[PDB]
Amino acid sequence: PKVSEDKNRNYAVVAGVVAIVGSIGWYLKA
Amino acid sequence: YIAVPAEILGIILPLLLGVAFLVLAERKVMAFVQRRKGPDVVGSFGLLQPLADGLKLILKEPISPSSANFFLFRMAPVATFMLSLVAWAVVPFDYGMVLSDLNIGLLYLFAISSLGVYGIIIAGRSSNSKYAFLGALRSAAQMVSYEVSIGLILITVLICVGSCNLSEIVMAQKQIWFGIPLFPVLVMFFISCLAETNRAPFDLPYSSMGFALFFLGEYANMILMSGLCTLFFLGGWLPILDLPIFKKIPGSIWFSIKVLFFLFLYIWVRAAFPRYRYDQLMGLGWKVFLPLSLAWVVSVSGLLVTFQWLP
Amino acid sequence: MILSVLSSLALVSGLMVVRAKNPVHSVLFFILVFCDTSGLLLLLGLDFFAMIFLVVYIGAIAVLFLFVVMMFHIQIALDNESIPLLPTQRNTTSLRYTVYAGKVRSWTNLETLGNLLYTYYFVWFLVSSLILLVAMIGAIVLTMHRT
Amino acid sequence: MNTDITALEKAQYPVVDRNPAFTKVVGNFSTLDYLRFSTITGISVTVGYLSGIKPGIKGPSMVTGGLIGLMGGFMYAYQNSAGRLMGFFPNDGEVASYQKR
Amino acid sequence: KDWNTVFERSINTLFLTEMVRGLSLTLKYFFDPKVTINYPFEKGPLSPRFRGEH
Amino acid sequence: MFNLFLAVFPEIFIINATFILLIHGVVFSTSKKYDYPPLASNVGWLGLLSVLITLLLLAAGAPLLTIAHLFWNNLFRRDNFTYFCQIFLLLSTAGTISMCFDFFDQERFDAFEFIVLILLSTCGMLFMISAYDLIAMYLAIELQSLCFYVIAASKRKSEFSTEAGLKYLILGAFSSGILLFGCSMIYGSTGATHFDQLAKILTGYEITGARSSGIFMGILFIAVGFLFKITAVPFHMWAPDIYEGSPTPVTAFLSIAPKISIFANILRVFIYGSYGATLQQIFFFCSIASMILGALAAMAQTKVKRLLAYSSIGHVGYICIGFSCGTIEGIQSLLIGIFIYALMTMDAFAIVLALRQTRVKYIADLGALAKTNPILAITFSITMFSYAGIPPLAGFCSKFYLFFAALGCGAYFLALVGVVTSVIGCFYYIRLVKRMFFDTPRTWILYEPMDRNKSLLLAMTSFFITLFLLYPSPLFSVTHQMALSLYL
Amino acid sequence: MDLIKYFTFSMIIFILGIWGILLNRRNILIMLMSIELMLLAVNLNFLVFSVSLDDMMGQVFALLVLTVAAAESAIGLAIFVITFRVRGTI
Amino acid sequence: PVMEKLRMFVAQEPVVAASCLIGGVGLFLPAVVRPILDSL
Amino acid sequence: MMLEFAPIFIYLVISLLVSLILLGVPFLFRFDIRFYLVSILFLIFDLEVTFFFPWAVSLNKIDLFGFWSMMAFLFILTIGFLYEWKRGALDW
Amino acid sequence: LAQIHASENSKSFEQIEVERALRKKYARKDEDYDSMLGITRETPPELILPDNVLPGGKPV
Numbered sequence A: 001p002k003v004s005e006d007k008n009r010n011y012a013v014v015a016g017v018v019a020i021v022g023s024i025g026w027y028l029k030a
Numbered sequence B: 001y002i003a004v005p006a007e008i009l010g011i012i013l014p015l016l017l018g019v020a021f022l023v024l025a026e027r028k029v030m031a032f033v034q035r036r037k038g039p040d041v042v043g044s045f046g047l048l049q050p051l052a053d054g055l056k057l058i059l060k061e062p063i064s065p066s067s068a069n070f071f072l073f074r075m076a077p078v079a080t081f082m083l084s085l086v087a088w089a090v091v092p093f094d095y096g097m098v099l100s101d102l103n104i105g106l107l108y109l110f111a112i113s114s115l116g117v118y119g120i121i122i123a124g125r126s127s128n129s130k131y132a133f134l135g136a137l138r139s140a141a142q143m144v145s146y147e148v149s150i151g152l153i154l155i156t157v158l159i160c161v162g163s164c165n166l167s168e169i170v171m172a173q174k175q176i177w178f179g180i181p182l183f184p185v186l187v188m189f190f191i192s193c194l195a196e197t198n199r200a201p202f203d204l205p206y207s208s209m210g211f212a213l214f215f216l217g218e219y220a221n222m223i224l225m226s227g228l229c230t231l232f233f234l235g236g237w238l239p240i241l242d243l244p245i246f247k248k249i250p251g252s253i254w255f256s257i258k259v260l261f262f263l264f265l266y267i268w269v270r271a272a273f274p275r276y277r278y279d280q281l282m283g284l285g286w287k288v289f290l291p292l293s294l295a296w297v298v299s300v301s302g303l304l305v306t307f308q309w310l311p
Numbered sequence C: 001m002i003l004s005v006l007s008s009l010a011l012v013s014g015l016m017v018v019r020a021k022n023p024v025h026s027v028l029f030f031i032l033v034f035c036d037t038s039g040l041l042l043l044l045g046l047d048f049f050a051m052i053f054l055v056v057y058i059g060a061i062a063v064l065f066l067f068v069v070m071m072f073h074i075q076i077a078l079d080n081e082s083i084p085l086l087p088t089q090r091n092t093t094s095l096r097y098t099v100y101a102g103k104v105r106s107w108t109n110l111e112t113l114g115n116l117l118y119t120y121y122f123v124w125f126l127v128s129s130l131i132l133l134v135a136m137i138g139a140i141v142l143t144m145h146r147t
Numbered sequence D: 001m002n003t004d005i006t007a008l009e010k011a012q013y014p015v016v017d018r019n020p021a022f023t024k025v026v027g028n029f030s031t032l033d034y035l036r037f038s039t040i041t042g043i044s045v046t047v048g049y050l051s052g053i054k055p056g057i058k059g060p061s062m063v064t065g066g067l068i069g070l071m072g073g074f075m076y077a078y079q080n081s082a083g084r085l086m087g088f089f090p091n092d093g094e095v096a097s098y099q100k101r
Numbered sequence E: 001k002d003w004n005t006v007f008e009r010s011i012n013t014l015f016l017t018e019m020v021r022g023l024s025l026t027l028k029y030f031f032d033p034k035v036t037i038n039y040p041f042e043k044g045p046l047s048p049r050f051r052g053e054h
Numbered sequence F: 001m002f003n004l005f006l007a008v009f010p011e012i013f014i015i016n017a018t019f020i021l022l023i024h025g026v027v028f029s030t031s032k033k034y035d036y037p038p039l040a041s042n043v044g045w046l047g048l049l050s051v052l053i054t055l056l057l058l059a060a061g062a063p064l065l066t067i068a069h070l071f072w073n074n075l076f077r078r079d080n081f082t083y084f085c086q087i088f089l090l091l092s093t094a095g096t097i098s099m100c101f102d103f104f105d106q107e108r109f110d111a112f113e114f115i116v117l118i119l120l121s122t123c124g125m126l127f128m129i130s131a132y133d134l135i136a137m138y139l140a141i142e143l144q145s146l147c148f149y150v151i152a153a154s155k156r157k158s159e160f161s162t163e164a165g166l167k168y169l170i171l172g173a174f175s176s177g178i179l180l181f182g183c184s185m186i187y188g189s190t191g192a193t194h195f196d197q198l199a200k201i202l203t204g205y206e207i208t209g210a211r212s213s214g215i216f217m218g219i220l221f222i223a224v225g226f227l228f229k230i231t232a233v234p235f236h237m238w239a240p241d242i243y244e245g246s247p248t249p250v251t252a253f254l255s256i257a258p259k260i261s262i263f264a265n266i267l268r269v270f271i272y273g274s275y276g277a278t279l280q281q282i283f284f285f286c287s288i289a290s291m292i293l294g295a296l297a298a299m300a301q302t303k304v305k306r307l308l309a310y311s312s313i314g315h316v317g318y319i320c321i322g323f324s325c326g327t328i329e330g331i332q333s334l335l336i337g338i339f340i341y342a343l344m345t346m347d348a349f350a351i352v353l354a355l356r357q358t359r360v361k362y363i364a365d366l367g368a369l370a371k372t373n374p375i376l377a378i379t380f381s382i383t384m385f386s387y388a389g390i391p392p393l394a395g396f397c398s399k400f401y402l403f404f405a406a407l408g409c410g411a412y413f414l415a416l417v418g419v420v421t422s423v424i425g426c427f428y429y430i431r432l433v434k435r436m437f438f439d440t441p442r443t444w445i446l447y448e449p450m451d452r453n454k455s456l457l458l459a460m461t462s463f464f465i466t467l468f469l470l471y472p473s474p475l476f477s478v479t480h481q482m483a484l485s486l487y488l
Numbered sequence G: 001m002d003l004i005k006y007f008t009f010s011m012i013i014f015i016l017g018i019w020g021i022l023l024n025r026r027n028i029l030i031m032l033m034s035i036e037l038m039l040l041a042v043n044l045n046f047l048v049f050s051v052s053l054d055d056m057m058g059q060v061f062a063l064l065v066l067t068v069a070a071a072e073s074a075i076g077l078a079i080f081v082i083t084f085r086v087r088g089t090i
Numbered sequence H: 001p002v003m004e005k006l007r008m009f010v011a012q013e014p015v016v017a018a019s020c021l022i023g024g025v026g027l028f029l030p031a032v033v034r035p036i037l038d039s040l
Numbered sequence I: 001m002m003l004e005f006a007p008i009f010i011y012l013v014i015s016l017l018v019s020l021i022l023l024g025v026p027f028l029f030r031f032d033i034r035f036y037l038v039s040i041l042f043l044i045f046d047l048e049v050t051f052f053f054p055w056a057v058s059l060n061k062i063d064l065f066g067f068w069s070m071m072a073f074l075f076i077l078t079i080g081f082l083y084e085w086k087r088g089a090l091d092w
Numbered sequence J: 001l002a003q004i005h006a007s008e009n010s011k012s013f014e015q016i017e018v019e020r021a022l023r024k025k026y027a028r029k030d031e032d033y034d035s036m037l038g039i040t041r042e043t044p045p046e047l048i049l050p051d052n053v054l055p056g057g058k059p060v
């Protein structure tokens, strides 16, 4: 059972991770 | 300058005679379509029937239904007669055969058509019958909903001309008639004129001269819309596109011939198809013609602008 | 002459509008007011604006007011800026200078308006569009009862 | 139609290519511009997903928020890049790249 | 279904192709002999068994 | 060509976001798969996100607001005053949207068009502040007026909402007609509608030789219409009724957002319309009457919303004190008062909406609030004292600096009226504080806990109100910068 | 003199609209017809001034005020219709 | 997908699809074709 | 330029006279809300067609800017019309 | 009265979550918006008690 099934929820997780990483880079690169 | 009333009489009286003979022509063409003959006993070929009808409705000793204000009821047919005839002052029949050559003629026609809603509304309320009132309200809503599409089609035509002068719209079709490129626009305009006049599948519906004036106004509207259909798309008075040897025929004859063709289309369409329902009239007129008219405006304007083919 | 009567009838119609017992008669005189105003505009040479007044005022708003009144209840109810010129035109009419340079290519009131309505002042055009959209949206939300 | 790109307040940084084209501004995007673009898009997508759970539409709200964030982030990045090219923002790298051109 | 079928039935919806087929029939009946009779002059056919005036 | 539109990205973004939200709501509200979801909170959250993103677009692009100024000259003028006014307006709109979230759930207001109309009104006000012409000013005024007319009568089944909507409609249309007649008489006398032209043509002839009747009457009519818009007496014909009958989340927005933009218009009219200090007298009388009537009318109020409406009228008069004295310090006092009043009003309306979940209508209803919720009572008392103007709080700074501006111009009569009105105001503001803490009602009303958005809004605004005096420098600096930029 | 007559006519229309607003406080339809009379008078002033000064800034604004007047009519009649349903009277 | 949702929309909404198509053509000509001809 | 409306006015007068003559010829011897929505839509689209009137005639002077301004105007009203559509205001 | 308690105390985890979601969804109502949309939201049978335990047997 090592698979997350909800495709929509997975995309939300990816978007949240991308938002956090981009915010960290924005606060660092500028 | 005292000859202007002569011109107005010469454009008004033959219009009434043509309306009467148009009623006769409808009752004859439907009879021929359905494998019979129309009125034939009265005249040599029934040509005297409208005169007999007129003398009948004149000589009826009728009573006035004074169970109302008696003013709005009596003037509503007069108002719709006003509006039906006043639109003929700008329609040109040949090069210089127009009573009033406005430079805003297309917009004046749009205004006159939009102001025709009041007569039926006033007649509907003035009659104490609530059911006639509701029917008049429905007819007014239908006329409004299709006048919108008529205006949009007018925009489609006006884009290619660049002027609101009716006599210049015809001269703009010297190369080719606008009915050839914009054939779907022509079909939509004809159908909208069918729905505007409360006629054809779009025709959901007191005594003596009030009903006579309403009847005459409706048939004058039919003639005027046939004239507009041949005026914007069929080249008006311009001859046939090819074979220029028959040029001895006056231009006023070609306009008449095309108007008669469109009147035959009115009679044909009403004879050949059943009636629509009100819940389908509004749905059709708001969901099939408004989007299509808007899309055609957009397409024509975009194509003319792109290749710099504008007037 | 034509101005005086076409203004007097409009004043009487407006007075009857603001002092009408039956609202249907008020709507009718309301229509007559704009019927006279269209002629007054025609006297100014603004042919387009008079026609639009016929189309908009007594073609859409007046019809809407008539719909509301009818089907619903029909219930009961000078010397400072521009000093005027005195009538001395026997010699003034002869003193009319006409410049043909402005007549060789003359624009109609319609194309004169459309020359700058859509290019040099297009933001106001879009703001009016937004106002129309607001009216469209607000008509439904206030008055809508399906099934 | 006659147009003028001059601004009331003069640019306080070196100006290169005073009236840049859309393609040239888009091709001037830096790492920071992509970072802020992605940050705005991801924030909008997350907000759309979280807000649409109660009505029951996660995917549709996700896509609507994604469109809003995409448009907003792209216009923000375009604004920054155009300002850098036009001299209204510190164009430390733009002048370095375009001096050797 | 097929794209060809969708295109074919969408064209017929828009081009009114099932109403032209009725207009053609009505027009073809327009140019045809009539079957009406001049009652005062010619009468309709009857039978020797006809039951009329006593 | 595309770079000429760098000056309108904040408006383009908000317009397109409103369109996308409208499409999303209309498509998914009338859906069968999701069983007609009530997606008002979804649209509200996405609209708040759109407001924040256009705030980021507008604030970051500060050097680019003057771009293509010649091309946009006839349409709008963007400068430092417009920049800060628009940022403040967006912040207020975001705060109102944040407050109105709990209204959509507990009361079950499922209409998503509320947020769309709020966003469209926001667009109208953005175009209003940067408007630099009579035409654009009137168009933006009408846009926001209709957006408010529609949402004032949102509660269709409510008796008060429909009547309030009708009254607001009639009053606003009459005021717009008066304003338009004034604009027409100005145009017919000077031949110009742009503010630059209308300032150049009026700055010379300061009624030195004769009084131009047309210009004077047009200026007076515009002033009268604007005074109707802000509801300064005797032009408050139906303002308390409109405030009471309107929905509370709606009433919160009309009490803050329209005033900022209308005051921006009045300032950009004073930059040219100072025709022999004619408006200074009108605003003098209006401010005196507004202070007096608000003070004398809010004492005879037993309902919370009518008292808030009369407080708004009184604070409008206090702000118009700054209009009466035409000076850089006067305008600075005016803007500081606007900012502080907007923040206090947002605080008070968030508190009211917190108690609105339990149907609060009278002041006596909030009687035992100091026992059931002993921190909400403290916050409400802080807001009331800030309204009163007690020195330690932030509401005292605005009244102080307004009185200073009034005394600078030499209008000693304004100072006495302001002092007496302040005494009366503090009396009926501490009257409310008496009810919460000192009275012991026989029957208590228990209110349900508030939500997170309003909780943080209350916390931030209450920390601002109490601790503003310690660090007030940035507000004074930005206000002085704004006041000077009105001319240079 | 013609500008004086046009301005006097428009001013009288404006005054009649204001009177209808004030006098007919009981009725609602008249309180919308009066607003429309006011807007009509203002549009007439703008058009007359544009013709008198030979300037196109009055015609553009009259055309733009047409939209505002029509939208106000629509919203007003919708509000009146919903108002009658609730309280059952005018 | 796209080739199925588009088919379903076109089949049950022929007039809307046709209007959208002709409007899209009329917007595509002055957006993609006019600049191309501007080079020539 | 505007001399061509006097024939129309005399035409109106004579049409009135002939209508009165025709009238004198025989003398010698609940509420539905959709009716409001249709009127609202008509008002909006009548204003739209009114705005088309200057654009179509002056489409030769303006070029690729007035066209796109009209296109944005149409896009806004088309979003409004789509809202009218899905909300069921176009049904009966 | 024992029957409703027995039917409530024996539910599974999956049924409890569904009933909680339904109870939250129908806790508050908005008749005006439903009338605007032409729909009529009705309480699901899982949130309806038998009429024989009501104070007087209320059918509506």
Ligand SMILES: CCCCC/C=C/C/C=C\C/C=C/C/C=C/CCCC(=O)O[C@H](COC(=O)CCCCCCCCCCCCCCCCC)COP(=O)(O)O[C@H]1[C@H](O)[C@H](O)[C@@H](O)[C@H](O)[C@H]1O
Binding pocket: A009, A012, A013, A014, A015, A016, A017, D046, D049, D050, D053
């Ligand atoms: C002891 C020393 C350390 C001590 C410090 C430890 C630190 C631990 C490391 C990271 C902490 C991360 C904090 C970030 C937290 C963010 C808030 C959590 C957001 C969240 O609900 O999750 C996802 C949502 O998805 C996103 O829409 C947005 C979610 C995107 C963000 C999730 C990505 C998390 C990955 C973090 C990287 C992990 C890398 C490894 C970390 C472990 C180290 C080995 C689950 O959705 P869902 O539909 O099933 O359910 C949610 C949820 O139940 C509630 O929000 C609502 O009640 C419900 O309506 C629904 O929204």
Ligand SMILES: CCCCCCCCCCCCCCCCCC(=O)O[C@@H](COC(=O)CCCCCCCCCCCCCCC)COP(=O)(O)OCC[N+](C)(C)C
Binding pocket: A008, A011, D045, D057, D058, D059, D060, D062, D063, D064, D065, D066, D067, D070, F020, F023, F024, F027
């Ligand atoms: C391009 C210009 C703008 C065009 C639109 C303008 C008008 C705005 C209209 C916005 C409202 C409509 C938005 C599209 C609605 C359709 C959403 C969609 O396509 O996704 C679907 C399905 O499609 C998907 O596969 C999910 C797509 C969402 C994830 C996509 C990644 C996030 C993209 C956001 C950022 C990019 C912007 C969008 C792409 C341009 C929804 O998923 P569900 O039906 O809930 O999943 C079914 C399973 N279950 C029922 C159990 C829940």
Ligand SMILES: CCCCCCCCCCCCCCCCCCCC(=O)O[C@H](COC(=O)CCCCCCCCCCCCCC)COP(=O)(O)OCCN
Binding pocket: B179, B184, B185, B186, B187, B188, B190, B191, B200, B201, B265, B269, B284, B288, B292, E013, E014, E015, E016, E019, H012, H013, H014, H015, H016, H018, H022
């Ligand atoms: C020389 C003279 C020639 C003749 C001139 C006169 C022409 C008319 C002659 C008579 C024609 C028949 C008239 C019948 C009258 C009633 C017909 C109305 C029926 C109708 O409205 O059809 C609708 C759809 O079809 C429609 O939409 C119909 C309008 C379609 C217009 C054509 C648009 C085609 C666009 C193609 C563009 C391609 C070229 C440019 C690239 C409803 O039908 P429904 O029930 O299915 O409801 C659609 C739901 N979805």
